[PDB]
Amino acid sequence: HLYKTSTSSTRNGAVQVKSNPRNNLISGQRRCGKGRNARGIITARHRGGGHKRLYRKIDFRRNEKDIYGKIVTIEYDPNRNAYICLIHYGDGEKRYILHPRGAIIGDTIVSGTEVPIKMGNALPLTDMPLGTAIHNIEITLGRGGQLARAAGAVAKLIAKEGKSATLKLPSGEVRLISKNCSATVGQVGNVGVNQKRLGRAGSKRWLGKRPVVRGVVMNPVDHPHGGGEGRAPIGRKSPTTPWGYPALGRRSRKRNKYSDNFIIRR
RNA sequence: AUGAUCAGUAGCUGGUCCGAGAGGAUGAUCAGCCACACUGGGACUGAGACACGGCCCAGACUCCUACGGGAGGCAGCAGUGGG
RNA sequence: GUUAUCCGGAAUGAUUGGGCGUAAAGCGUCUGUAGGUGGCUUUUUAAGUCCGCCGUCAAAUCCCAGGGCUCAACCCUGGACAGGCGGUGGAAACUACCAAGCUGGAGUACGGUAGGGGCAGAGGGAAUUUCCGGUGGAGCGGUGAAAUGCGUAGAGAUCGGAAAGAACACCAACGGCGAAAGCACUCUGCUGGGCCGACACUGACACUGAGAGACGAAAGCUAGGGGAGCGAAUGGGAUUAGAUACCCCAGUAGUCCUAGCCGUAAACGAUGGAUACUAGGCGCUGUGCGUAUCGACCCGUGCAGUGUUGUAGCUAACGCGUUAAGUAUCCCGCCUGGGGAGUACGUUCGCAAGAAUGAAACUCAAAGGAAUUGACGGGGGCCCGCACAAGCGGUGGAGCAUGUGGUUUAAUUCG
RNA sequence: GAUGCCGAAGGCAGGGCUAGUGACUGGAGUGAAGUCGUAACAAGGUAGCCGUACUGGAAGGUGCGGCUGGAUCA
RNA sequence: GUGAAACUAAGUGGAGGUCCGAACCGACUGAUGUUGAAGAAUCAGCGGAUGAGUUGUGGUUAGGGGUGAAAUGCCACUCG
């Protein structure tokens, strides 16, 4: 840790120390996915089970404009770890929005064109100096996708660029997307919240997904490779079904091809 | 902590040896005091020793035996063995 | 006579008697409890201290004077001493206690000054690298030479634009600030210390300080970010007898930020802090004054800071020299041969790497400091010989003479 | 006499501490002055050393920070 | 106790796939059986036991295909 509110670390005593939640909810939920990795005919792509899910919620695109706000209190949501608060616009529109950084006390929070740049709400990139700290960009002028993982959701820019295309995605290198888009302009979601360690699985891993490791475990049928006294013919192409883990490369197009540039591969 | 407790070592002092002195090292002989006297423990007698040459019990040794059972201990003087 | 053993020689633990810039030695720097020390006046106490006296300090040793064994050793009279402790009757300057003050100590307020002091948040300029596009050509990069590498899927160079990180020229100065470490582009916000000046006020409320608490260059470590350049490691090229170095082309951790941790350095002025004194000549910052300051300036008076053929003095010498290792006082830390060691063991601290405290056996008789003479130097300054350079001829090639090694031989004699 | 308290000899379990010893093993001090380098001392010829980190037959090399008990006109 | 912090000594509280042990679940070892009670379990011991635990009911995937902490087991006393 390097910032305040250090992550609690359960000292030794008995391998690990699970827990038992207990809270309340107030509307703002449909039912969320509750069928486990399936399809109705074939599970497809194994690894995925365990209960403890539900609770979906919404609010992403944000069509509201020049409307003040007031972040009431903070709140956490399953799956994605980066808070979501509950805010409270000047008028009284019940929403959530991705919890920026320095807030909780309400702060400003406001969307629309020509608004105070800091970490309010939606704000068209068309009106942005450099953009050293955005948040969640959108492929189009209406969606709210891309890096929605508030935590670590970073994507610098290139000061002022024409042709209506900039954005500097993290591990995704740099690409070109419409400029007529908007974002929360937060680019924050706490990094220490994910800095913590799982522990030793059991009551922390399975409670979210089935075993992630498979191993050779022999059996030429159960897996493209296997057999032998104990060792495994690794490297000799052993991916589940013609895959190819040694890079190779994918995603091939010609017309609607990738508009990303630079993209270094070391 | 102006240092308890613990561990190693040791009788104390008057004095002795050295040193110009201070100090340092010791305290054999003579004398005062303390402690012990086969080892551990205990009491009795008596003004006083719970007492080398007193008693009782236990232990390790030495010696006697009709082995049933008993007798001793110089860290008093002179001496023996041993070191 | 030898050996053993204590003391002396050892002012080599020094209380009388020593030291810590370089020889062993100030802990890396502050704050601060206990402890040690503490300005000036009067009164008082008089505990310490001092005077006298009364007890005890056994005798015998030791010492002084005097006796007896024919001397002496030895024995012996009296005295001295037993440096101490307690008590009583005094003395009162000093130290200490108590009371009332004073002020030069120290502290505070008022008004100003300088500074990279510190923390946080912004913003500014050059350059480097990278991405895209234009122009254009075959070379570029690099070295003592080269090569690896980048190049005609066309770099470099050049121009336009973008992204990003770090440090921030000049001013910078023998400068300044800070306890130390350390800290410099500009701005704002909060904040510490130092200094001067007419003063106003308290009033010694002080100094130092084991333990303890806090701060710590860089490197390193934990978690999360960032990453232009540089660059441990590592991979190639080159050099070389070899180089798993120096040098060349790349390059990871790291270097940067937040938080926590480790606490070490020629943490060096290698000379701990505080105070009072002792010859002088030049360089900063505040303030007073100087025909009305007519001026760049002139004459003082304080803080901090260099050099000095720096004097006395001090020092082994080098050197220091009122910011002295000069003359003194207060208190704390440290050393008392070299190697082994600042390691081993144990305790404590740490995530780890390790830090702190700290031995002995054995072994040598030497380690070490300054300075002196000379030599040496792929150190410097200046100078002389075919010494080089300028030039001619020659050797090493050839046949032959001769000398020497090696070989051979009974010897192929010796130097 | 019996009984009870205290109680030495002696007995049991588990620790601390100390001396001796121990396959094997680390570092260190010496002796022929052997083998491979020559790292330091004159800028010893990439100045040296201190702390720290990594690497290497070895002396040692390299990075960062710092000092000079560094030569030189820089 | 420190200027304020970490610290420490009680109490409170309460976590831990924790410890012991029934129901339950899962089953290592020995014996009795193995034309047996039973086409394989019982008896005397053992492991787990608020847990990635277990169970009742219903549904979704099913063979060259599904599922699988994959034994290539299982897919209803059969099966790579």
Added chain:
RNA sequence: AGUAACGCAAACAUUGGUGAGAAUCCAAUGCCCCGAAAACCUAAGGGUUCCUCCGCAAGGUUCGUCCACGGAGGGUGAGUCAGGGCCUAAGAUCAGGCCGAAAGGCGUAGUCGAUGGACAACAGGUGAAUAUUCCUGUACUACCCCUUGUUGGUCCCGAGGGACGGAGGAGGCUAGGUUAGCCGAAAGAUGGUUAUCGGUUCAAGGACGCAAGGUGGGGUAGAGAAAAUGCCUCGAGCCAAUGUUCGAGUACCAGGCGCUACGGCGCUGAAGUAACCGAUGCCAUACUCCCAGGAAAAGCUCGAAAGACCUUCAACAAAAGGGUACCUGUACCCGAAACCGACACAGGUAGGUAGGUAGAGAAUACCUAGGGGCGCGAGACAACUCUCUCUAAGGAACUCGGCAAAAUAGCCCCGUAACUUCGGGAGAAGGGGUGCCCCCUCACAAAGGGGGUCGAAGUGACCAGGCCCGGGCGACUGUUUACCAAAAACACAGGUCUCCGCAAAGUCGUAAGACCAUGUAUGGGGGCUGACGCCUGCC
């Protein structure tokens, strides 16, 4: 071969009745076993196997006047229970439509389907077999219509309320139990005993809404948005186990009086209170804490640009009137021999109630209620086999292996090594006491501290770890070859490499569609490795 077997080792016999005959039928006197069970109730399934009167060749691995056997009759009567009926999850189907050779797949409006949610009573008595349904006493809910009072009502809704989750830690209170009082009976076949045994019950509804550690009102104004934003005047509402009354000056009830085919029915019928201690029960769908922060709809309530309605129809309430509340199952069994396994095979199988004594305990052992003796016996009784007791000296010396046994195994207290990421091992190891009575209080529910005393033994019964040392491997818990191997196998978290800014990669599919994520590179997917510590070289 007529050998074995006649199916857990919870033994059985006797006096009578009936019959041709009965050890196993029935009746009576007992033994014995179980006692959170081989009791009862209920779901699934089964499904008439329940009851009664008869018969029995076959089915009951003995007979049988016995039977869940056969052959004839009789018997499941609730608007409140349950299933239909409203609503809804996984999921199925699914107009038009999107797709696919045909077939068909997928999928929405909409429409089905639960172990989910939503209105309403019990206590007695009666019958050979049923009963919260028959009967008696006392109550409740919803709809329609009517009467009275008041008031504006009003869709496939908006909003509120419904939707419940973990674990852990306090108190009260209830089932129920014990003691005492009271009532009734017996006061007694070896001594003593005027005191022994039994009962002491009692539901909903309604009122009460219970000294309470559960959970800020009200009024006015606002064309965009509004889980809403500003003032004023006073501050004291919901939810809720239990108890106390009415309900029961009743019924029930020990025990009698009569009858009796003797199984059982009529009549009558006293006491019916208090104190102490409860639980994994209830208020706690709570609260505290914590985090892997964990269904939907309807019923209900309220509001609806007061659109449609508009002296109306309706809404609320009152008589807590009157009428109505249609259709089915509901017998028996149900960790049981009528269920699932070919049988009456000790195998397997969800939920609920569940007492006394000792004990922490639904442990264990012995007793209640209640349910059984498991359906071949009697003698003999040697070898041998199966399940066990007790066993001189020594002691594993057996053996592939101390397998199998034995033993250890209670609580409190004292004490406890190497090592440690120092959480542990430490329930190490190794010891002592705890019985009973009396006294201190002639009880402060226990416990402790003294004294005295009994037996060989005092957790003395059941129940109830064996410990220590060194070493290989896997960190561990967990999972796995369901019916011989469950292990250093597998799994696990940690680390790293690689692919994807996406209608994803990738997986299912000829397609559509869809899973993967309504997430998103501290995401996710695939491979190897795989706790941590020191490290992970050259090519």
Added chain:
RNA sequence: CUAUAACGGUCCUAAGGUAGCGAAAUUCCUUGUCGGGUAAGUUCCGACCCGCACGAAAGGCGUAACGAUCUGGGCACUGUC
């Protein structure tokens, strides 16, 4: 002084196995050798070591606790003998 011979020379490769460990569940001959345990022990433990085919995350070297794991020893208790 034998061995050792760290040194050197030479041939062959992409580079030629570093640290640690090693007769270890992976060295046939090794029933190995030395030392400890036993009256005796090809079993086990501690080392040396000439590891025939140990070896760095298809992991190497350690490692508290944990496991109905595998191997060996001792005490109490056992006719298991």
Added chain:
RNA sequence: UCCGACGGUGCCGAGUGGAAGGGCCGUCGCUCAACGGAUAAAAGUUACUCUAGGGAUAACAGGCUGAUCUUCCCCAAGAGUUCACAUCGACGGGAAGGUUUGGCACCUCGAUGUCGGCUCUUCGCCACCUGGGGCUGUAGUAUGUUCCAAGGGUUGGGCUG
């Protein structure tokens, strides 16, 4: 062999006249070697195994046979101080027995369970001990060798299956 290239030959050539093609004469292409050559073109495992058959085809074992192995014996230079044979005995030879190592693989793969230990034995012999004898470089006490004879008896543990 078949598939094909090309020349010659008016042989034929599906309406006719030609042609393509075919036929005939002549030649060429195939480590087609596993070469009387199955394809133009095709390597392994199966301790998961399954099925059809046989011992005419193996493994344990019986049997035939049996060089090797075991035992005994002949000639005999020498060792044993001397001396060949108390004992032993080189260079070679002849047999018995039969449990070793093999061949055979004759009878059994519509099957006869491998080793070892434990329990309980049976027989023979060139029996180690007890008994009766010869020689002895056997003094005695004890041994060496040989002959008859087994009547009987003939061990407990550490380690390893």
